[PDB]
Write a protein that binds this ligand. Structure first.
Ligand SMILES: CC(C)C[C@H](N)C(=O)OP(=O)(O)OC[C@H]1O[C@@H](n2cnc3c(N)ncnc32)[C@H](O)[C@@H]1O
Ligand SMILES: [Mg+2]
Ligand SMILES: [Zn+2]
Length: 773
């Protein structure tokens, strides 16, 4: 054993030792229990930095920990090759997207292999490969027939810089997720995933996720935005029916979020395009000027009356400029006494305010709005008949049974979740398998003729969809009739491949479907998922929706894709722009380590200067995995000094007697200072085993091993029994730190014990060494 700690010699040799052993290339071995640990797979938008290194190290620490405990661990690594992240980097460097992606894929693969992660590289996947995106094309066509995927025109978010439409989850604070430019609204036909059909299921199965951060679960609940309301039909008075015809001659439908205020409704609003408005304006030019006005808050009365179905009040129908047509049934009711917007609309034209809700005993001010009138949590009913005294949860249920008895209403549920538009006017993306025929229409591509191969030899000029300028691509024959037809030149979003890549890892070479029904049953769901919280509304929701699709198609049998979720904290560093890199202007301050700010420390520059063990140790020790981590060079130096201490500790031990048999069995006869050291040992083994697999607190697990070494240095171990205890302390330490730093621990383990480390396994707690003296 050399006296100096040389990472340049111990790390490549240990990586080859692991590669030759093939301890990460796992199959469906039924002997061991499975453990699917997954880290969010990166965008090939350039070189990885230490921020990604923390993400993938946190996953490696968990994967190596379970592996040491006799687990069949699958830690796979892939490349999120399609979409804007890679294509924008290709255009920024003036390179074809296919070339820039593949060359950066092979650089990022060598970046991760230098860090020595326990990755099953035989399961490596590139989303841009046709052997991959053919199956999301397959699922696209099968869902298109079922109507779950549909094409429709409408109002969409438009990115002027990225020159493409965006989904609602890709619009961050009214700006684009990749561009930051302000989003515009356009009328463009798109392909949508009917994610609203799964809105209720995506909301209830959230409670199943007991091992998800409650922040991620809460953000999804607000994004779905479920609200329970009431659809109320107001019978038009027999005199006010003159003019209307159809359903609008019988009743007028409204939706209200607070239907406990039904009796307190003093009037009713309507839209300008509503037939009840145009019929009342056929003889009134004062309303034909309002109908033509909007087509603030203004309103005109038309003498039309509807019947409040719960008390019989004859509420007049007002034409308002705030009732948007097409949204809902194009009409609402008005309760000014318990609605701020209706209080302003009624204090504007002097309309009644029959109070119906009390909050404890706050004196009701008639013409003074107060925040207690919208209290849907601490309110009973007044002046409502058989509703007086019922809370909102009871007043809702009583009004529902009341309206259903007359047939003038029923409860209705609404979500703020809109359908998922996936059409993109970009080149680098999965082609949409739809062929437009003038005779047949939008027909899907036959499954035998999949994939619709995206030509890789394209360099976008930067002015419009490049696929719409390639006749040799979009000119084809109709698969239904055989005539002239055009291919769909729009491509899918990058969040389509990332919504099922965790299943493709189970069978990356399977040529008959998305995932083999055999391996899908063996791996089940992802046991541990690690990735940034920025995907709580986008990817982490898209993945759950795609899983419920693939399940309802018969390809997988689980409901949720990820059991546990760990949103690791962001690594931060000072930034400079004019963007300038620290190792090479203005001072932007401490910011997230990102390529879009050029404050990223390259992992390869650190391994060349300190080694992979030093970089991984600094990431795991500087802070808990969920906490933000500030980059510190002294933190890098201190982590290296400890790895020197661990190396020098084993050297001086071996240089003073050589390897002996580690102490085991009954410890009576041992001295107190050695009984105390074995006590600290097995307290550390239990503390580390608990900080890894329960608390997931790696920094305090490293600190616990350091305290064990502090007591080892303070304990005299030169005797015959001291060496045996000293052999036990070091055999435990190099196995406890192995998930954090496997290169140095594998080297020191073989210098202490001839056996293979992973067959020695995780250190056990000798509880006899824990009892006090
Ligand atoms: C499933 C897919 C939609 C994932 C998508 N391809 C993606 O986000 O990929 P991207 O290549 O952007 O990053 C890969 C991973 O690295 C994390 N990450 C990035 N910067 C930092 C940082 N400063 N500190 C800590 N962690 C960081 C980031 O949260 C992500 O889990
Ligand atoms: Mg459960
Ligand atoms: Zn046809």
């Amino acid at each position: 054993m050399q006296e100096h700690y040389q990472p340049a010699a111990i790390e490549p040799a240990a990586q080859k030792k692991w590669d030759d052993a093939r301890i990460s290339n796992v199959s469906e071995d039924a002997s061991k229990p499975k453990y699917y640990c997954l880290s969010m797979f990166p965008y090939p938008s350039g070189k990885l930095h230490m921020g990604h290194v923390r993400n993938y190290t946190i996953g490696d620490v968990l994967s190596r920990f379970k592996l040491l405990n006799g687990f069949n661990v699958m830690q796979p690594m892939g490349w999120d090759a399609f979409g804007m992240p890679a294509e924008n980097a290709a255009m920024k460097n003036n390179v074809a997207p296919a070339a820039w992606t593949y060359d950066n894929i092979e650089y990022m693969k060598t970046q991760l292999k230098s860090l020595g992660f326990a990755v099953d590289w035989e399961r490596e996947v590139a989303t841009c490969k046709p052997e991959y995106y053919r199956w999301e094309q397959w699922l696209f066509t099968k869902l298109f027939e079922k109507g779950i995927v549909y094409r429709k025109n409408g109002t969409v978010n438009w990115d002027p810089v990225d020159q493409t439409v965006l989904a609602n989850e890709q619009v961050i604070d009214g700006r684009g997720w990749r561009s930051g430019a302000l989003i515009e609204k356009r009328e463009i036909p798109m392909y949508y995933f009917k994610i609203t059909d799964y809105a209720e299921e995506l909301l209830n199965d959230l409670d199943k996720l007991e091992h998800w951060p409650e922040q991620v679960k809460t953000m999804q609940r607000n994004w779905i935005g479920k609200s329970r309301g009431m659809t109320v039909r107001f019978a038009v008075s027999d005199d006010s029916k003159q003019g209307l015809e159809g359903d609008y001659a019988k009743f007028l439908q409204v939706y209200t979020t607070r239907p406990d205020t039904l009796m307190g409704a003093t009037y009713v609003a309507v839209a300008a395009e509503h037939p009840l408005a145009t019929a009342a304006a056929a003889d009134k030019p004062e309303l034909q000027a309002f109908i033509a006005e909007c087509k603030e808050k203004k309103g005109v009365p038309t003498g039309r009356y509807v019947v409040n179905p719960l008390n019989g009040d004859k509420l007049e129908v007002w034409i308002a400029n705030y009732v948007l047509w097409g949204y809902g049934d194009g009409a609402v009711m008005a309760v000014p006494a318990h609605d701020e917007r209706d209080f302003e609309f009624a204090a504007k034209y002097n309309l009644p305010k029959k109070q119906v809700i009390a909050v404890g005993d706050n004196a009701f001010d008639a013409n003074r709005w107060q925040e207690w009138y919208g209290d849907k949590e601490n309110g009973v009913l007044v002046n409502s008949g058989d509703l007086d005294g019922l809370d909102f949860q009871t007043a809702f249920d009583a009004v529902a049974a009341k309206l259903q008895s007359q047939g003038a209403g029923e409860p209705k549920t609404q979500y703020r979740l809109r359908d998922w538009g996936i059409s993109r006017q970009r080149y680098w993306g999965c082609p949409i398998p739809i062929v437009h025929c003038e005779k047949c229409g939008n027909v899907p591509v036959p499954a035998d003729q999949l994939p619709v191969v995206l030509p890789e030899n394209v360099v976008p000029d930067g002015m419009g969809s490049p696929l719409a300028k390639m006749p040799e691509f979009y000119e084809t024959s109709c698969p239904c009739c055989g005539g002239a037809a055009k291919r769909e030149t729009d491509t899918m979003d990058t969040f389509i491949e990332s919504s099922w890549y965790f299943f493709r890892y189970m069978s990356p070479k399977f040529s008959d479907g998305m995932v083999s029904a055999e391996s899908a049953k063996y791996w089940g769901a992802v046991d541990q998922y690690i990735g940034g919280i920025e995907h709580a509304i986008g990817h982490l929701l898209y993945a759950r929706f795609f899983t419920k699709l693939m399940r309802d198609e018969g390809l997988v049998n689980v409901d949720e894709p990820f059991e546990r979720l760990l949103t690791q904290g962001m690594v931060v560093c000072e930034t400079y722009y004019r963007w300038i890199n620290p190792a090479d202007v203005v001072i932007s301050g401490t910011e997230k380590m990102s390529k879009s700010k050029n404050n990223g420390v390259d992992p390869q520059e650190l391994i060349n200067a300190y080694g992979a063990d030093t970089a991984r140790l600094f990431m795991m020790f500087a802070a808990p995995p969920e906490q933000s981590l500030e980059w510190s060079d002294s933190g890098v130096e201190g982590a290296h000094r400890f790895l020197r201490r661990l190396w020098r500790t084993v050297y001086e031990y071996l240089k003073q007697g050589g390897a002996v048999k580690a102490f085991a069995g009954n410890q009576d006869g041992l001295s107190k200072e050695l009984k105390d050291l074995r006590h600290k040992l097995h307290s550390t083994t239990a503390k580390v085993s608990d900080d890894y697999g329960r608390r997931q607190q790696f920094n305090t697990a490293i600190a616990a091993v350091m305290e064990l070494l502090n007591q080892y240095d303070k304990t005299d171990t030169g005797s015959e029994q001291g060496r045996a205890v000293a052999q036990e302390v070091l055999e435990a330490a190099v196995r406890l730190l192995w998930p954090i730093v496997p290169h140095i621990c594998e080297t020191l383990w073989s210098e202490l014990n001839g056996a293979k480390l992973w067959e020695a396994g995780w250190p056990t707690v000798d509880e006899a060494a824990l009892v006090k003296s």
